[PDB]
Structure formats: C-alpha cells, structure tokens
Symmetry: D2
Amino acid sequence: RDEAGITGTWYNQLGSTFIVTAGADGALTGTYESAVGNAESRYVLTGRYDSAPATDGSGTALGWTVAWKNNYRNAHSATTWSGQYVGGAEARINTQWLLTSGTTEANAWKSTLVGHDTFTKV
Amino acid sequence: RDEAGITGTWYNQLGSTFIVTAGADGALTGTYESAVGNAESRYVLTGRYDSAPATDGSGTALGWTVAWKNNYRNAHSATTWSGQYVGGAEARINTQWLLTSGTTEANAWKSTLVGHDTFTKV
Amino acid sequence: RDEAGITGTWYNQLGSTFIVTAGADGALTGTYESAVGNAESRYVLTGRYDSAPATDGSGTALGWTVAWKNNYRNAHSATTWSGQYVGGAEARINTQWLLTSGTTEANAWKSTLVGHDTFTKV
Amino acid sequence: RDEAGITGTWYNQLGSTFIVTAGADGALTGTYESAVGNAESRYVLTGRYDSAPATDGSGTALGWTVAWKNNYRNAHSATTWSGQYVGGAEARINTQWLLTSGTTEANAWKSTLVGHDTFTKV
Ligand SMILES: [Cu+2]
Ligand SMILES: [Cu+2]
Ligand SMILES: [Cu+2]
Ligand SMILES: [Cu+2]
C-alpha cells in the first residue's frame, strides 16, 4: 500500500500540478491544474489505484480523470491518465493519457489526443 | 446536461457491463464488470463528465477509471476510458482506453495496452 | 502468407481508400486517400507485415505510414496505422492509428491524435 | 528539408538503435534493433516524413513501421512509431508507438501496446 506515497502534490514536465488523496480502499480524489491548454485554476479529479500491489518490485497501477469544466471555463473535454506509481528516492508517477473533446459525429475521428506525463514530487 | 442520459446500465462489444450514476456536478460513480481478462464480478469505478456540454450537436466528454482489485481478484492494473456520450435514438458512449499494469522498470515498455470500446444501452 | 489476401483495395468506416501491394518479403507499398481532414487525392504509403504468421487462427500483424504531403497539399503531419489483417469470408484489417503533426515545442503536448480504423474489401 | 538531419543512427531510452536514410521525396528506409522484447539483430523498417516542413519552428512529422520478422525470429507483431524530428544542438525524434501482435479474435482486445520513445544522436 502506497496510500501515503501517493497522497500529496505532484508536478509534471509541463509544469502542471496534481494534488491527490489516496484512500485505504483504492480511491483517488483531488484537484488538477494544467499549465497548458484551455484551462484555468483547479479542476476536480477522481480515480482509482491498486491498494495492494505486487511485492516483487513492480509499480502500483492507477488512473484518474479530469473533465475540463470548473467555475471559470468549460473546454468540453476530459482527460484520463493511466499509469503507475514507482516509489523510492526519486518517486514518480509515469502515465499515458487520452484527452477526448466533445465533437460532432463528422469530427469524431479528430476527437482524441494522446500523450504521456511524468509526475514527480519536486 | 446528460445526467439522465448517462445514468444507467451500458454494454460494450465484448459483453462487458458498465453501471453508472452521473451527478449534477460532473461526478461518475458505479461498477464495471469485464467479460474478458483477469477479472471477476464487479469493480468500483469513478470518473467525470462535462455536465454543461456544447449545444451544437457535439457529444459530451467523459472518462472513468477502474483499478482491477476487488474482493475476488487483484490483476495489478488499471484501465481508463476516455470518450464521449452521444444521445438520441441509438445512444452510445464511444471510448478509447489505456490499461496499465504495474511492472518492474525493465518491463515498463510493455506496461500499457490501448483499445477502443463502444457502449450501448441494449 | 497473406500476400494475396492483403494486396488490393480497402475501404474504412470514414470512406477512405487504401490501395496496397504486399511483397513476398514483408513489404507494403501503395497509396492512401482520406475522406476527411487536410488531405486531397492520393498520398504515398509504405509499411511492413508479418509474411509468415502463426497458423493457430491468429491475425497477421502489419503497419503502415502516410506523410500528408503530396503535390496538392502539405498538412505537416504523418499517420501510422498498426493492426492486424484477419482473412476469411468477411476479411478485415483492424487498426489503431497515431497522427502526429509537426508543432513547436510549446504545443508538443497536443501534437498527436489517436483513433481506430476498420478496413474492409467492400 | 531535414533529409540530412534525419539520415543516420539514432538511439532511444531503452538502448535500441534505429538506422535510417531519408530520401528527397519523403521516404524513410533502414533497420531497427530493439534492446527489449522478442527481438534479435536487425529488422527492416520503412516509413515517411514531411520533406517540406513549416519554417515557423515546428518539428518535422514522420513515422515508420517494423514487422518483427527477420531471419532469426518472428514475434508475429508490428510496431509503428509516429512522431516528430526536432533539429538543433540536441536533435531528437520524439515518438509515440503502437505495437500490435497477431491474435485470435477472442484476444484482439489485448493485441495492442502503446508507448513513447525518444531518440537522440548520442
Ligand atoms: Cu499478486
Ligand atoms: Cu461552450
Ligand atoms: Cu510462430
Ligand atoms: Cu505550410
């Protein structure tokens, strides 16, 4: 259990900030603030993590979602990050993400961005 | 707002079942049961959707996560679906997904599956 | 060997047309014409397929690339499809694709679209 | 035109080696040697790049495929990398990739890995 290891403030390579609490059950709750895109201030996030990971040196699987609507803006989109938490001196969350925008059916083919973010504690 | 449209029971092309409640705020909560993979019975899911979508015929962006741990099994993995809800006579949720397994750092390159699921009400 | 099975004209769900020749060695060569996006007429494609697939009912792995420059337009982008050919009465090529646009380093986070195309012979 | 800039030997974060020639037309040809996975020695690659990129500081879009069959092994799979070449003192090719294995239709849902490689000249 990486409940303690996960909980806190994380920063990615874009300068975005992810603030999360991990629950004993597997819950992830918090806020996300993106340094890029059609976004301002904090957005709610929710997700899940493996609260009983393998003890063989494997990372801890997790994922979370942000819908990009808050009281300032609505970018009609949602991002999900899927990845793993790796503990130890340089702890990291290594993710890949899918950002889907709401589109008309004609534009559905261009609805979804894919990328990768790495989060660190500093 | 597709709070009503989203809430309920959905089925994908694999025969999996997604049961979800959409909150007025943008919350998604429920359970997922996969017809395939290292999975049995129901797993908690959480996510977010755009509760005030565009009124121009665009779909409604949403995403959710499942960590594949429940009281029966732990597959040390999490899937996130990112996609859009499209309302109307044949309502659908069209998604793409990332399934990340916890791995050692040597195997991180093969940690993540990608696919696409389409959910319908029947 | 699906050299014969692959070679020919294929159509996806968007109305795009893929014309390909499979070589005995594993080469794929041909042209692609997209029904959507910043594209007109035919673009060169090249790729590779597994010329000696498993005989256990598995599909045949393959992939190809298109850079979206031809004598009519240059959309400063490339798509790669990665997937599998499935032979038999309803033959199909089931793919997932990554479309990367050239961007400045500030916009690199939004450089890459992901989607899925299914190609059929009719 | 980055024909000169692209052509040569590149190394990624896994220790794999990509040797490529860029043609004036947009062709990419060469060999790939993976440091990981079910692979040994060199495999043919082919692909395409944007031979007339934007002059606004944007990267150069490109992609290539490897089918993982050579005279030593056949891993019944193909990878496509899609990304961009960024020139200058630290030149890089930043990619995302899809690795599809041939599978039975029952296992198609787990056919495709996704990841990201960064290639440098040293
Ligand atoms: Cu275990
Ligand atoms: Cu709006
Ligand atoms: Cu074999
Ligand atoms: Cu231009």
